[PDB]
Design a protein around this ligand. Structure first.
Ligand code: CL
Ligand code: CL
Ligand code: ZN
Ligand code: ZN
Ligand code: ZN
Ligand code: ZN
Ligand code: ZN
Ligand code: ZN
Ligand code: ZN
Lengths: 207, 207, 207
């Protein structure tokens, strides 16, 4: 019985030792899993996580998904409004422009035609387009604001008008002085005080 | 020996107790790892997973990668075909248009010129362009279908023609009535029954 | 005491057995965690990982983020340079072009006008624009190289000029023969040896 107990004790010792080795294996295996690189992955914008789902956040004016990342899903608009333009050099006059702005994705294309005459005093005129001078400002006013990248440079503008019964047309340029205001510069077809009529302006911006 | 066995038993008890505490530590540590947030991350379109690899799925007509996400990789096409256009108001006639469609990324730019005369009966005419009236329909017909976003609005179209030995040219507008059919509306340069010739149409769509 | 030791031994055996079952549970639970799918996720371009952060890598000429993935952030440029163009069929002459290149995102729009006369010998002329013939090559020369996708096709070019006191204007086409060289083809308004002047070229490329 002392001998029987001693044999039982030797058996227990063996089992305890097995358990001890199984616990050392589990300790190593759990050490790995605690350090696995994929734990604490995070996602910077335009990637985001909500309830375990990783998403690409998409500006619908620029892109969308149809399985794959493709172009804009937002509805195009053709806005129609009146914009009073201001002579800001070579003219102190104003002129009403009937404006169609075709907004498709983040491109806004302007087609403008004037009503009335603009009095000019020099051979070149600067004509300013400030969002505050728009009558019945559209809802999606964001469609009329150029992006910061677009604003950094002058952009091409087609201009045409009549003066003293003759048509003039020029490839000219505009530039934004701020996010709400651009000015175009164009020749007036002559010198001195005169009136130009049937002013048309065609240009486009990236918003 | 009873005393020796009792000392051995006290030693085993101590070892069993250590094992027990090592197992409680492992149980807590495994509880953490079972709940780690990064487990069961999923990826919604345009993101996808295949064999552990997370990818951005890219429409090659819109974007591609050159390390960074950049613009289209698909080859531009210049398609040339004949499109029979239909007078649908102010005309019951038809006219064959020779069409160059310049497809670059998801922009398709149309340059059309007519062969023949179109009989008009009013001062304004509606001219319809249905994909079914294209002769030798191109392979990439998808390049001639506007996106849902683009279809939501009228879009600018340049039109010019001759009538009674005089040129006319107008900035006009088209609109899609369905994904396969657009109609342009333009003045005819006069009134009554007449024939216009040398019709040219320039416009573009987002696909 | 033999009986007391035997009772202690039976108690230890019970504890060892509990420990053994707790270790088998932990072994199974650790087996799961070792195989979890989210372990060893990787990210293919334009997705990337740095220090646990997953990012969308963005070409700033094409896209940016303002929370959501939107259009370009790079500053637009209006470049002005002189490009000597080469007659390469129907002319052996050269002509200096004053070029405005409006670079907005990955679109580059060219507005060119000539200084001088170009001698032509046929009714059609090919005029070549090689980046090596640009005087004072701009810094961002990449803005003048079409993308591989754009190069695959001919593209529309507007051309106008004067010849013998009369204006001519044509919708024409260019094509890249390599990434640095495009040629435009246009009618010369007549036949035989003559001089054209006031050449203007308007076209655009995707870069
Ligand atoms: Cl004993
Ligand atoms: Cl144990
Ligand atoms: Zn013995
Ligand atoms: Zn894990
Ligand atoms: Zn006034
Ligand atoms: Zn003792
Ligand atoms: Zn007919
Ligand atoms: Zn007993
Ligand atoms: Zn020469």
């Amino acid at each position: 019985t002392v001998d029987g107990n001693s044999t039982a004790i030797s058996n227990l010792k063996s089992d305890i030792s097995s358990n001890g080795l199984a616990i050392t294996d589990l300790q190593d295996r759990v050490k790995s899993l605690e350090s696995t690189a994929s734990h604490g992955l995070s996602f910077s914008p335009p990637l985001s996580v909500a309830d375990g789902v990783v998403s690409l956040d998409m500006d619908p004016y620029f892109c969308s998904q149809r399985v794959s990342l493709t172009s804009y899903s937002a509805e195009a608009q053709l806005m129609q409004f009146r914009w009073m333009a201001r002579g800001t050099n070579g003219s102190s006059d104003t002129i009403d422009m009937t404006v169609n702005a075709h907004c498709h994705g983040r491109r806004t294309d302007y087609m403008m035609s004037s009503t009335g005459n603009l009095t000019v005093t020099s051979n070149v005129v600067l004509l300013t387009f400030d969002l505050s001078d728009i009558t019945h400002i559209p809802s999606d006013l964001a469609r009329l604001v150029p992006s910061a990248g677009f604003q950094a440079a002058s952009f091409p503008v087609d201009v045409s008008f009549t003066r003293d019964s003759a048509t003039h047309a020029y490839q000219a340029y505009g530039v934004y002085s701020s996010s709400r205001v651009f000015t175009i510069t164009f020749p007036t077809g002559g010198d001195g005080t005169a009136n130009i009529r049937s002013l048309t302006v065609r240009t486009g911006i990236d918003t």
